[PDB]
């Protein structure tokens, strides 16, 4: 096709302030529970004082041995900020008597009694110490957010309790519904604790049309209701942009009789400066209208919201265990999420919440809570086998995943050599478990010394542990693409990651040369700190840093030596076609596709959007597939 066009071309031609929180007024009750019970559910209301106060409570009621208390947060920002605040509250130095811990960001020392970490980091600690011996109480907070790392820690700590009487465990939730959690921890007690009282509207009839119904609801609220900001919820950037242009235009129009209305976005890709615009005041004769994803469900506040929409949809990962495949599907929210959404109107006064569905559908048709039934288990089965769990299928899980997705996960880990056939940890599977990565990234990294390019592959695995780096604004895609080309590598977007990191480490720039080379500084910084942490684990575990003199084929072979399974042939009569599953995909419209040695790709990410796409792709010689995983490239199994 490229060749034929070239042929036709040739042929042609202060202390007292914290007293005031609600949890103080039940602190007595909260001993008597903590004291009498090895495990305890506590359930609040977000703002009630639990993240701050309850760990402090525990550190007077339960004190000196050589031991700490963990608190666990699903959210890096909540861990960091609440550890800073709680250090002030105690009157102690941050990183000392109170400290963090986050992936490639530790702020603790040999003084730390109270240790506010991500769930993911307590789980990695528990890979290195399956008794968590160094903790005398462990407090799994925001348990309602039912992350993978909290669900695995809940499972683990069930078992660890019946090995260690001197471990007490405190599951803390913002969703009043504890029954499920009590039952799953052997009928354990409950203790149930500043939100104002939200009015709740429902439609009389199922909507079929929720975008235009949400737009008309927001303009109605802006005409008819008194002062108070609006928080819509919508499901992704494209939708959110569209509704920001059309409520900006319709609100200008009704400005001929109605106050001024300032829209904003919010969604996961936004640059920092536009994120900060969400917090602006609410003009002057006037109101404001945040148009957010689920990030505004729990993960922040915006201070003046009095009215919430709620078309009860979000964009959730789903994994089929008998096709083998994740997708990213617009889907009805849980009842717990719908409640959180409602409770964003309520922070600053009474509030209202305008649910674009029936009261029957809230009560009877939303699922209670949403992650173990929506995941590829490969990481999870590596972690369980590091935890010594030899009968995966029997592991005591409050919702067991499909035994087919567990079986598929062992088979992947065997083809990655992390496990032997007999489901037992190889020396790779041990070392891979030492890294806080997915198994394919960890395997790549490990082997990279033996492709003579472990510095290069350290840098690319750091980059692939963060977002996309490349800003492309919808006004200036030509300028952004021009920029991106001055790091691009023709059929090697993994090598493009290496090039833009190296240029970010060049003796020539910082922040403003990120913005003038359309780069996310926040990404590139985070990738630099994860490169530093992962190099420290490499040193710790003896994996020699190695480079060559300049060797792209070595980079290619290393990447294949993790991502072998994620390969995609060019079709020779049709599109592109995949080694696992036999899907029929296209290369993602981010990346051109030099169809002349292209004939196999290795892909980072499969992206489901209305079509099948495969995203961040790099060329591979198919002979180097057959030499670097002969057991996965057996015709025989094909």
């Amino acid at each position: 096709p490229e060749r034929w066009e070239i042929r036709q071309l040739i042929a042609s031609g202060i202390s007292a302030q914290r007293q005031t929180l609600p949890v103080y007024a039940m602190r007595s009750e909260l001993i008597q529970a903590v004291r009498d019970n090895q495990f305890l559910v506590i359930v609040g209301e977000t703002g009630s004082g639990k993240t701050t106060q309850i760990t402090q409570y525990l550190d007077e009621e339960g004190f000196s041995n050589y031991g700490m208390i963990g608190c666990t947060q699903p959210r890096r920002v909540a861990a960091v900020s609440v550890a800073k605040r709680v250090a002030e509250e105690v009157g102690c130095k941050v990183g000392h008597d109170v400290g963090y811990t986050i992936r490639f960001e530790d702020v603790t020392g040999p003084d730390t009694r109270i240790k506010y970490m991500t769930d993911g980091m307590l789980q990695r600690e528990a890979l290195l110490d399956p008794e968590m011996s160094k903790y005398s109480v462990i407090m799994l907070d925001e348990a309602h957010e039912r992350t993978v790392a909290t669900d695995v820690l809940f499972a683990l700590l069930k078992k660890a309790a019946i090995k260690r009487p001197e471990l007490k465990v405190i599951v803390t939730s913002a969703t009043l519904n504890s029954a499920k959690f009590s039952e799953y921890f052997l009928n354990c007690p409950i203790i149930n604790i500043k939100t104002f009282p939200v009015e709740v509207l429902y439609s009389q009839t199922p909507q079929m049309d929720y975008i235009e119904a949400a737009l008309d609801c927001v303009i109605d609220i802006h005409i008819n209701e008194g002062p108070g900001d609006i928080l819509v919820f919508l499901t992704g950037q494209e939708e959110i942009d569209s509704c920001c242009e059309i409520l900006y235009d319709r609100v200008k129009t009704l400005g001929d009789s109605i106050g001024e209305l300032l829209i904003l976005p919010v969604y996961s890709a936004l640059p920092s400066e536009i994120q900060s615009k969400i917090f602006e005041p609410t003009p002057k004769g006037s109101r404001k209208v945040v148009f957010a994803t689920n990030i505004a469900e729990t993960s922040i506040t915006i201070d003046g919201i009095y009215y919430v929409v709620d078309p009860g949809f979000a964009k959730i990962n789903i994994y089929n265990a008998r096709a083998g495949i994740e997708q990213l599907i617009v889907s009805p929210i849980s009842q717990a999420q719908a409640n959180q959404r409602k409770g964003r109107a309520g922070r600053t006064g009474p509030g209202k919440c305008y649910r674009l569905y029936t009261e029957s559908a809230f009560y009877n048709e939303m699922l209670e809570n949403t992650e173990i039934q929506r995941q590829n288990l490969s990481h999870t089965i590596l972690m369980l086998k590091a935890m010594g769990i030899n009968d995966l299928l029997k592991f005591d899980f409050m919702d067991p995943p499909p035994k087919n997705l567990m079986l598929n996960a062992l088979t992947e880990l065997y083809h990655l050599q992390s496990l032997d056939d007999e489901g037992k940890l190889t020396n790779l599977g041990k070392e891979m478990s030492l890294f806080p990565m997915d198994p394919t990234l960890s395997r790549s990294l490990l082997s990279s010394v033996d492709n003579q390019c472990s510095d290069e592959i350290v840098t690319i695995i750091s980059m692939l542990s963060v977002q996309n780096v490349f800003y492309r604004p919808k006004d200036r895609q030509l300028e952004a693409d021009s920029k991106k080309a001055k790091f691009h590598h023709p059929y090697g977007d993994h090598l493009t990651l290496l090039n833009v990191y190296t240029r970010w480490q060049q003796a020539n720039y910082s922040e403003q040369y990120c913005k003038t080379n359309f780069l996310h500084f926040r990404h590139l910084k985070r990738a630099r700190d994860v490169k530093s942490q992962i190099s420290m684990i490499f040193k710790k575990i003896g994996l020699k840093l190695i480079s060559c003199h300049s060797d792209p084929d070595l980079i290619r072979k290393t990447f294949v030596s993790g991502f072998f399974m994620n390969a995609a042939k060019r079709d020779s009569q049709v599109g592109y076609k995949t080694i696992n599953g036999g899907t029929e995909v296209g290369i993602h419209p981010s990346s051109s596709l030099y169809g002349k040695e292209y004939e196999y790709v290795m892909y980072h990410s499969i992206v489901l959007t209305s079509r099948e796409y495969m995203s961040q792709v790099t060329s591979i010689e198919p002979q180097w597939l057959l030499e670097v995983a002969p057991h996965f490239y057996k015709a025989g199994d094909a």
Binding site: Q204, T205, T358, E359, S360, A361, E365
Partner: protein, 39 residues
């Protein structure tokens, strides 16, 4: 209440699904007949 709306919406969706099935199942039945005779 909302039970009447849920039952009527589910009955309408089931009726439209049965109508699409019975449009796949007169003309198109005999088209499948002619195709099976050609097979």
């Amino acid at each position: 209440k909302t039970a009447v709306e849920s039952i009527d919406e589910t009955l309408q969706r089931l009726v439209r699904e049965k109508e699409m099935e019975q449009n796949e199942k007169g003309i198109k039945e005999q088209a499948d007949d002619k195709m099976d005779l050609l097979e």
